A paper describes a structure:
N-acetylmannosamine kinase (FnNanK) belongs to the repressor, open reading frame, kinase (ROK) superfamily of proteins. The salient unifying features of the ROK scaffold are a nucleotide-binding region in the N-terminal region, a strictly conserved catalytic aspartate residue that serves as a Schiff base during phosphoryl transfer and a zinc-binding motif that is implicated in the stability of the active site of the enzyme. Once host sialic acid has been transported across the cytoplasmic membrane (by a two-component sialic acid tripartite ATP-independent periplasmic transport system in F. nucleatum), degradation of Neu5Ac to fructose 6-phosphate starts with the conversion of sialic acid by an N-acetylneuraminate lyase (NanA), yielding N-acetyl­mannosamine (ManNAc) and pyruvate. A phosphoryl group from ATP is then transferred to ManNAc by a kinase (NanK), producing N-acetyl­mannosamine 6-phosphate (ManNAc-6-P), which in turn is converted to N-acetyl­glucosamine 6-phosphate (GlcNAc-6-P) by N-acetyl­mannosamine-6-phosphate 2-epi­merase.
In this paper, we present the crystal structure of apo FnNanK. The structure of FnNanK has one homodimer in the asymmetric unit, corresponding to a solvent content of 38%. The monomer structure has an elongated shape and is composed of two α/β domains that are connected by two hinge loops (residues 119–125 and 269–271). The putative active site is located in a large cleft between the N-terminal domain, which is made of two fragments (residues 1–118 and 272–291), and the slightly smaller C-terminal dimerization domain (residues 126–268). Forty residues of the helix cluster and connecting loops of the C-terminal domain create a 1479 Å2 dimer interface stabilized by direct hydrogen bonds and solvent-mediated hydrogen bonds. The conserved residues in hMNK (Asn516, Asp517, Arg477, Glu566, His569 and Glu588) that are required for the coordination of ManNAc are superimposable with Asn106, Asp107, Gln67, Glu156, His159 and Glu168 in FnNanK. Although FnNanK retains most of the consensus motifs unique to the ROK family, the lack of a zinc-binding site with sequence xCGxxGCx(E/D) is evident both in the sequence and structure alignments. However, FnNanK retains the highly conserved His159. We find that despite the absence of a zinc-binding motif in FnNanK, the major structural features that are implicated in enzymatic function are not compromised.
Numbering used by the authors:
A (entry chain B), B (entry chain A): 1 to 291
The structure:
């Protein structure tokens, strides 16, 4: 007894089976080919279903890209990276085709729910969980429930303002890569950039330190709004910490007042790139039972 | 019966009786004299209680200054304007002294609950309420409940960043006055500032327009965090009413995406400077009413 989980990212689709206890049982990967459009993605989903059809999945749980109404499983907006993706009720399409319960939820909410279930939030009822990849987004857990916003787009932290501009444009991993490119002429990986800092090359120390300041600028605005006790950081370059987590703490605590930091902890996501599949599966199980 | 409501500001204390339906029955004012300290505050509360003892109030509901844990009624921080105020467990002290139920809550949470009870939040289960006076603060209502934060200081919106610096420093009424003072040498009250704009004085039109942009910068960050459907603005120059609200709305809608503005209302608080007394009383009634 397992769940067929599908994590549709802008570049990769990761899929496999998740147990009723939130354990990854198997995983695979396939290129999204986002520019080929919705019917491309539905074809890939169909091949995923045949590959697992005889595992008798109780349903299909999908983590998607873009702005999504997760109550009904509809893409309502976001960046137009996949033609005809926006507007799609994937719960509609897949429930009719495969005659199984479906959920569709946006990317960072699934990660947050994954960490809530079996990850860095498993002992928490409240936290803010941010992923730092190509952009910055957040999933908000308040009194044990995901907080989606009145129009399902709460937690789009990447668009808040910091001193330099949009949060995302200066504190995502993409922004870090861009800062290195602007100053050194080199187009590097997040790992490659931090390896160079590990060799104490001054140029990369100054850029990463500047990027950390951009990052804790935006975090402090979030903390003044929410006064959380727990922030969970994930994605990409968070692969780096605990040493990264500590620098982020030190930088942040200089920018927020005593009542905002005295009970505040910042910790690393535990589930890595599986959080999305796990969180989507958590949502599917809520939908199936109770009720 | 009735509720004895006390609104402690940094300069004045406003107090009187509030009905069980949220109606102001009487008000008085007396100087806070903040520098005289906690024992001074307790004396004023005592004289306030003696004046109304013979109406047999069901309890004392206090809107306080500073950072406050409203669940237990203790001052936990803020700017140290009243010696020994911070650390004071006012509910413990007053329930023992007067043997009536007491509540103590921070300023903008009381305003929010006031607007929730009988003001602009009368029919809403979710909203964000900002006061725009000497600083900027907010009370957050989510699923019919005040959202205080894990350490009781959620909603300190004045400290989030905008491109120019701290929100409060460029978008409070104090900031507007300071902007007029820096550009013209004159110290005006805000009515005087907007009166000069109605006279199409170019200098004051340009300053107010710049101040409005500062304000919607900060609001846009709040909207990206919370994706509310209802924002209630009160305090200071919001006295100007609908002509100002509409300009704020137009300025703001240029800065947030369709899913954030499609269902969003900017509305004016209805209760003015009586909201605090009314909301503190709402809180006391919540404490009193159980089976």
């Amino acid at each position: 007894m397992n769940i067929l989980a599908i994590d549709i990212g802008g570049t990769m689709i990761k899929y496999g089976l998740v147990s009723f206890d939130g354990k990854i049982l198997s995983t695979d990967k396939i290129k999204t080919e986002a520019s080929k459009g919705l019917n491309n993605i539905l074809n890939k989903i169909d091949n995923i279903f045949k590959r697992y059809k005889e595992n008798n999945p109780v349903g299909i749980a999908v983590s998607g890209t873009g702005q999504i109404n997760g109550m009904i499983g509809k893409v309502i907006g976001g960046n137009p990276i996949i033609p005809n993706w926006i507007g799609t009720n994937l719960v509609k399409i897949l429930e009719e085709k495969y005659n199984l319960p479906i959920v569709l939820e946006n990317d960072v909410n699934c990660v947050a729910l994954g960490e809530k279930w079996v990850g860095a939030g498993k002992d928490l009822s409240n936290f803010i969980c941010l992923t730092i990849g190509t952009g910055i987004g957040g999933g908000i857990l308040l009194n044990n429930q995901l907080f989606r916003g009145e129009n399902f787009v709460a937690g789009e932290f990447g668009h808040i303002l910091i001193k330099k501009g949009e949060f995302e444009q200066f504190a995502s991993t993409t922004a870090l890569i861009r800062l290195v490119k602007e100053r050194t002429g080199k187009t590097l990986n997040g790992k490659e950039i931090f390896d160079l800092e590990k060799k104490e090359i001054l140029e990369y120390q100054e850029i990463i330190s500047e990027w950390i300041e951009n990052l804790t600028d935006g975090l402090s605005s979030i903390i003044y709004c929410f006064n959380p006790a727990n922030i969970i950081l994930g994605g990409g370059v968070i692969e780096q910490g605990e040493p990264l987590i500590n620098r982020i703490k030190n930088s942040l605590f200089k920018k927020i007042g005593p009542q905002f930091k005295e009970k505040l902890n910042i910790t690393q996501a535990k589930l890595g790139n599986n959080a999305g599949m796990i969180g989507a599966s958590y949502l599917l199980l809520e939908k199936i039972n109770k009720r």
